[PDB]
Design a binder for this molecule. Structure first.
Ligand SMILES: O=c1ccn([C@H]2C[C@H](O)[C@@H](COP(=O)(O)NP(=O)(O)OP(=O)(O)O)O2)c(=O)[nH]1
Ligand SMILES: O=c1ccn([C@H]2C[C@H](O)[C@@H](COP(=O)(O)NP(=O)(O)OP(=O)(O)O)O2)c(=O)[nH]1
Ligand SMILES: O=c1ccn([C@H]2C[C@H](O)[C@@H](COP(=O)(O)NP(=O)(O)OP(=O)(O)O)O2)c(=O)[nH]1
Ligand SMILES: [Mg+2]
Ligand SMILES: [Mg+2]
Ligand SMILES: [Mg+2]
Ligand SMILES: [Mg+2]
Lengths: 154, 153, 154
């Protein structure tokens, strides 16, 4: 079938499936943001999708970013009616450096880049264009609810 | 079809689909509990559901709570036929204030309320009735496993 | 089919197991003994490969016991159709560092204290070969061609 995608700015990029049978469409950052230990942000994708009713999108981590960095993405449940900007819900869960500073910053590959500041160690720079998350779409069941006193069939 | 729900106490609320085409059902806390930085708890819903065979429940965060507070909910996999009280598996992942106390507490909206004690900064109070989590029901594939020496299709 | 092929990569490997015929997932066992101290991160090998067919994704995910009773945080892995690699449990010990308090026991994945081979920092876990650390839940996926549109039709 087809999934409609709107790009909402010049900074947006069509999501992308790595191989032909891969679960997820890789999702790209539309923003450049510095995120220091213990900091939280919603990173904009500048992408809207129209998931049909009877499916849910799971906006979720990539295992390389996840395993190799302190960047923790809380999986977002994207409803069928939602035509807004998909935001990536992120925390840098590194423990604070208590003021050790260094001239480099980490990127989402776990490598060190040149920065515009001498920044606290454990700080990441997410750059516009970074392949930061993925979007997996799964069918759902959304029945009517019946309150009962008894069910019937850690 | 229909999903059966049992309210297990007077503090239990029915799960709630917010908007017409929402994936899941919002789940309320049946307890009032303080959760200071780095603390963990299973928050009782006092609700049981009966997910049919062929499905799993995902008992998961709401994006507002998740993004605006330090309350981290670990997604629960709710098996068909689990008829127990659904527990919300939660951590306050704020780093401890090292002794700094404030007369307010945070709630799940990110906002400050009067509290019963002067409490460590970064503490949340979860109140009975708070819309804390959500439940999304997905079909599953549950095959027999075959051990193979080599993969063959 | 209603068959999933599974390939054990070593003698430290254990066949995944369903807990009841009503359970969503297959319990997945550690193939390695690893110590994980507060704030540390690792990918725990299972020495299991699976062949998830096209149209599905595996979700390599926490068990509620381990998760609620310990500081071991497992980031849910999205296991693609046709990935025949070693399944890796992406794990962090998210306890805050005990700053040099050491004790003769270590924690296990059940929240209990075991004798260990070193006097280690308090909050450290020992994950043992054969521990039932995660589960795998397999769900159908929707993988449509994306259509970029100008307008659709928290
Ligand atoms: O990580 C996320 C999560 C959600 N979203 C969007 C899509 C989703 O359909 C919408 C609402 O998700 P939640 O229901 O998880 N948030 P909450 O329940 O706090 O807000 P609302 O009152 O709108 O349902 O927010 C994101 O862009 N990224
Ligand atoms: O966040 C959760 C997760 C699970 N549960 C319930 C429903 C689920 O069917 C049940 C078991 O889930 P797991 O299989 O993840 N727990 P574990 O494997 O530790 O226990 P068991 O041996 O009972 O399967 O616990 C919750 O109430 N909240
Ligand atoms: O926790 C995990 C996650 C993934 N995996 C495997 C299975 C999956 O099919 C593969 C890649 O998953 P991602 O797409 O999340 N990783 P990434 O996007 O960083 O790498 P790739 O470039 O391989 O897509 O790694 C694990 O063994 N454990
Ligand atoms: Mg990938
Ligand atoms: Mg909602
Ligand atoms: Mg289990
Ligand atoms: Mg933490």
């Amino acid at each position: 079938n087809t999934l409609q995608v709107r790009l909402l700015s010049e900074n947006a990029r069509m999501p992308e499936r790595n191989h032909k049978t891969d679960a997820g469409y890789d999702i790209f950052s539309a923003e450049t943001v510095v995120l220091e230990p213990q900091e939280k942000a919603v990173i904009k994708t500048d992408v809207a999708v129209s998931i049909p009713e009877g499916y849910v999108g799971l906006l979720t981590s990539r295992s390389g970013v996840s395993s190799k960095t302190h960047l923790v993405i809380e999986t977002g449940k994207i409803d069928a009616g939602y035509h807004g900007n998909l935001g990536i819900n992120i925390k840098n869960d590194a423990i604070a450096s208590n003021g050790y500073i260094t001239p480099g910053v980490f990127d989402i590959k776990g490598e060190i880049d040149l920065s515009d500041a001498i920044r606290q160690y454990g700080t990441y720079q997410i750059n516009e264009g970074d392949k930061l998350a993925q979007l997996v779409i799964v069918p759902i069941w959304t029945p009517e609810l019946k309150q009962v006193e008894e069910f019937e069939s850690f």
